[PDB]
Design an enzyme around this catalytic site. Sequence first.
Site, PDB file in Angstrom:
ATOM      1  N   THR A 271       0.804  -1.211   0.000  1.00  0.00           N
ATOM      2  CA  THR A 271       0.000   0.000   0.000  1.00  0.00           C
ATOM      3  C   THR A 271       0.848   1.277   0.000  1.00  0.00           C
ATOM      4  O   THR A 271       0.420   2.329  -0.547  1.00  0.00           O
ATOM      5  CB  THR A 271      -0.948   0.009   1.197  1.00  0.00           C
ATOM      6  OG1 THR A 271      -0.217  -0.319   2.372  1.00  0.00           O
ATOM      7  CG2 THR A 271      -2.023  -1.043   1.015  1.00  0.00           C
ATOM      8  N   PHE A 396      -6.459   4.528   6.938  1.00  0.00           N
ATOM      9  CA  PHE A 396      -5.751   3.553   7.791  1.00  0.00           C
ATOM     10  C   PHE A 396      -6.662   2.754   8.730  1.00  0.00           C
ATOM     11  O   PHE A 396      -6.217   2.277   9.771  1.00  0.00           O
ATOM     12  CB  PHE A 396      -4.669   4.274   8.641  1.00  0.00           C
ATOM     13  CG  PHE A 396      -3.577   4.928   7.817  1.00  0.00           C
ATOM     14  CD1 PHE A 396      -2.562   4.161   7.254  1.00  0.00           C
ATOM     15  CD2 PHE A 396      -3.594   6.301   7.588  1.00  0.00           C
ATOM     16  CE1 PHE A 396      -1.549   4.751   6.455  1.00  0.00           C
ATOM     17  CE2 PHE A 396      -2.601   6.919   6.790  1.00  0.00           C
ATOM     18  CZ  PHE A 396      -1.567   6.131   6.219  1.00  0.00           C
ATOM     19  N   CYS A 403      -4.445   0.698  11.250  1.00  0.00           N
ATOM     20  CA  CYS A 403      -3.122   0.333  10.765  1.00  0.00           C
ATOM     21  C   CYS A 403      -2.057   0.538  11.832  1.00  0.00           C
ATOM     22  O   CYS A 403      -1.891   1.639  12.347  1.00  0.00           O
ATOM     23  CB  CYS A 403      -2.792   1.222   9.566  1.00  0.00           C
ATOM     24  SG  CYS A 403      -1.158   0.905   8.863  1.00  0.00           S
TER      25      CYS A 403
HETATM   26  C1  HEM Z   1       0.050   4.061   3.108  1.00  0.00           C
HETATM   27  C2  HEM Z   1       0.105   2.753   3.299  1.00  0.00           C
HETATM   28  C3  HEM Z   1      -0.760   1.985   4.168  1.00  0.00           C
HETATM   29  C4  HEM Z   1      -2.186   2.016   4.160  1.00  0.00           C
HETATM   30  C5  HEM Z   1      -3.086   2.828   3.284  1.00  0.00           C
HETATM   31  C6  HEM Z   1      -2.581   1.060   5.218  1.00  0.00           C
HETATM   32  C7  HEM Z   1      -3.928   0.773   5.565  1.00  0.00           C
HETATM   33  C8  HEM Z   1      -4.390  -0.071   6.487  1.00  0.00           C
HETATM   34  C9  HEM Z   1      -5.771  -0.342   6.818  1.00  0.00           C
HETATM   35  C10 HEM Z   1      -6.980   0.348   6.096  1.00  0.00           C
HETATM   36  C11 HEM Z   1      -5.828  -1.270   7.813  1.00  0.00           C
HETATM   37  C12 HEM Z   1      -7.129  -1.823   8.438  1.00  0.00           C
HETATM   38  C13 HEM Z   1      -7.697  -3.027   7.684  1.00  0.00           C
HETATM   39  C14 HEM Z   1      -9.003  -3.592   8.253  1.00  0.00           C
HETATM   40  O1  HEM Z   1      -9.548  -2.987   9.145  1.00  0.00           O
HETATM   41  O2  HEM Z   1      -9.491  -4.636   7.766  1.00  0.00           O
HETATM   42  C15 HEM Z   1      -4.469  -1.604   8.083  1.00  0.00           C
HETATM   43  C16 HEM Z   1      -4.067  -2.588   8.982  1.00  0.00           C
HETATM   44  C17 HEM Z   1      -2.769  -3.000   9.218  1.00  0.00           C
HETATM   45  N1  HEM Z   1      -1.649  -2.462   8.655  1.00  0.00           N
HETATM   46 FE1  HEM Z   1      -1.579  -0.924   7.344  1.00  0.00          FE
HETATM   47  N2  HEM Z   1      -1.553   0.455   5.854  1.00  0.00           N
HETATM   48  C18 HEM Z   1      -0.410   0.986   5.256  1.00  0.00           C
HETATM   49  C19 HEM Z   1       0.893   0.637   5.605  1.00  0.00           C
HETATM   50  C20 HEM Z   1       1.266  -0.307   6.539  1.00  0.00           C
HETATM   51  C21 HEM Z   1       2.670  -0.623   6.841  1.00  0.00           C
HETATM   52  C22 HEM Z   1       3.923   0.075   6.215  1.00  0.00           C
HETATM   53  C23 HEM Z   1       2.628  -1.690   7.794  1.00  0.00           C
HETATM   54  C24 HEM Z   1       3.647  -2.343   8.368  1.00  0.00           C
HETATM   55  C25 HEM Z   1       4.753  -2.049   8.929  1.00  0.00           C
HETATM   56  C26 HEM Z   1       1.180  -1.917   8.014  1.00  0.00           C
HETATM   57  C27 HEM Z   1       0.712  -2.886   8.852  1.00  0.00           C
HETATM   58  C28 HEM Z   1      -0.598  -3.141   9.140  1.00  0.00           C
HETATM   59  C29 HEM Z   1      -1.044  -4.224  10.064  1.00  0.00           C
HETATM   60  C30 HEM Z   1      -0.133  -5.209  10.759  1.00  0.00           C
HETATM   61  C31 HEM Z   1      -2.385  -4.102  10.129  1.00  0.00           C
HETATM   62  C32 HEM Z   1      -3.317  -4.953  10.980  1.00  0.00           C
HETATM   63  C33 HEM Z   1      -3.428  -4.237  12.332  1.00  0.00           C
HETATM   64  C34 HEM Z   1      -4.305  -4.865  13.378  1.00  0.00           C
HETATM   65  O3  HEM Z   1      -5.476  -5.104  13.106  1.00  0.00           O
HETATM   66  O4  HEM Z   1      -3.817  -5.164  14.528  1.00  0.00           O
HETATM   67  N3  HEM Z   1       0.426  -1.073   7.305  1.00  0.00           N
HETATM   68  N4  HEM Z   1      -3.571  -0.854   7.289  1.00  0.00           N
END
Ligand code: HEM
EC number: 1.14.14.1
Length: 461
Positions: A271, A396, A403
């Site tokens: 992403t 996010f 996120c």
């Molecule tokens: C601009 C880039 C990024 C966007 C737009 C983004 C977006 C999101 C979104 C929308 C969710 C929620 C999904 C849901 O509720 O079903 C999420 C969860 C997550 N993201 Fe990101 N993300 C980004 C970058 C990252 C990066 C760089 C990492 C890692 C180092 C990351 C790790 C995670 C993890 C591990 C979750 C699950 C968290 C949990 O529920 O405990 N994300 N992200």
Amino acid sequence: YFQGAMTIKEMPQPKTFGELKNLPLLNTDKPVQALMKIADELGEIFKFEAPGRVTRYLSSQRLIKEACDESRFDKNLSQALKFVRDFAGDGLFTSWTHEKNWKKAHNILLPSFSQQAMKGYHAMMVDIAVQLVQKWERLNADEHIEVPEDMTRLTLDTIGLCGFNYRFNSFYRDQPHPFITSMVRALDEAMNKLQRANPDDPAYDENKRQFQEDIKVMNDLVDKIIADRKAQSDDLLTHMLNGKDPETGEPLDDENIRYQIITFLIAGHETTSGLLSFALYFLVKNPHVLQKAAEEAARVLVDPVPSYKQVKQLKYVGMVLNEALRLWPTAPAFSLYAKEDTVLGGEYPLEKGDELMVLIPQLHRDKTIWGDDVEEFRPERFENPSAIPQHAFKPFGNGQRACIGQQFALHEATLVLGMMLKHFDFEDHTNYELDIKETLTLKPEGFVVKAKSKKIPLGGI
Ligand code: HEM
Ligand SMILES: CCCCCCCCCCCCCCCC(=O)NCC(=O)O
């Protein structure tokens, strides 16, 4: 008194097709974009059914702010995430909130994303950023840049180095890293399965075969990372291996660690690559915004390589990224389920367990929140964060399931776009027509540009 909604009208819903319900309507490789059109037509909410399932897509801030009330709704795994869960298991992204390893891994890994951990990742992010800049500085006259391809070389390498002290060395490969190829194929299969009425027909056997093979490739890279850690650092991987849940007094087991590594390698870069691609796309299509952002980079990045503090000062660059996320959030939807029977927005009854899908690109085009110029790329909308209504901007996710890498992603992206703007002038030499490829996540496809060096020296990392 009876607690039902005061007024209840017919739930909007697009054309159905017999036992296939609405499935046919998304017989396309751009399902999110098609849903956006449906939302344009039907409004803030509509029902979508496929054999064996039903959900309600939400597009308005009015409804989404209620859906974000964690006391009433919890994260649901959309059909899409259910398919990703086959290879990402109960890693953080694809685990249920009430599934044992979610809270446990959450507690063990959150410190890897603290302010102090970010400062600690900065030198490594600069290391991969310098490789990106040098690649472009080294292109010949007749050459151009494949944007998403190069943003993916940068983001995978960044999460690989910062999180696992492992070098994928993507800039030493002229074709995509093998992991990327199998990962893209695997997400594309998860996406395509969404439209398979009979997934078990033997006509999909080759698909399954390939899926298995792609999962194997991803898992082989995980073994290499783990073996390479055995062959010192204090990073994400260190925490995965040693961290103890302060609630259970125990670390994650070997099975879950592997899912977490797969999870972070995918979620930790894909992403972010999309975001960097969309932001450059928008910059080259809005010359004046590009110049204003260029000016800030020139003004702030006065050193050979960006310092942590300087990245924090690229305010307008950060607004550009937030505006690219408003228009094209790269993880375009997140799902929720009702914890108890309830009424949404005073008029849409839901039973315990009912699912909702937040269509983020539509939420981000809600005119009552953003005015009528929603389609325009205007970073100035983010001039003052305080002014934005709660739950109006959600690229996010939400609450405890938001996120975990948000700050890591925006720091990386700010640093990189800042450096790009400082070192090069860009040219949309082909008058690129935006073509958004969907693999659950979103990214421009075929986006290319020409960069002309400003010839500013770069310092040793
Ligand atoms: C601009 C880039 C990024 C966007 C737009 C983004 C977006 C999101 C979104 C929308 C969710 C929620 C999904 C849901 O509720 O079903 C999420 C969860 C997550 N993201 Fe990101 N993300 C980004 C970058 C990252 C990066 C760089 C990492 C890692 C180092 C990351 C790790 C995670 C993890 C591990 C979750 C699950 C968290 C949990 O529920 O405990 N994300 N992200
Ligand atoms: C392991 C890391 C997880 C990476 C997975 C990234 C997921 C990003 C958000 C997914 C958005 C899902 C959109 C699905 C839209 C869709 O096609 N729905 C129609 C349907 O259900 O048939």
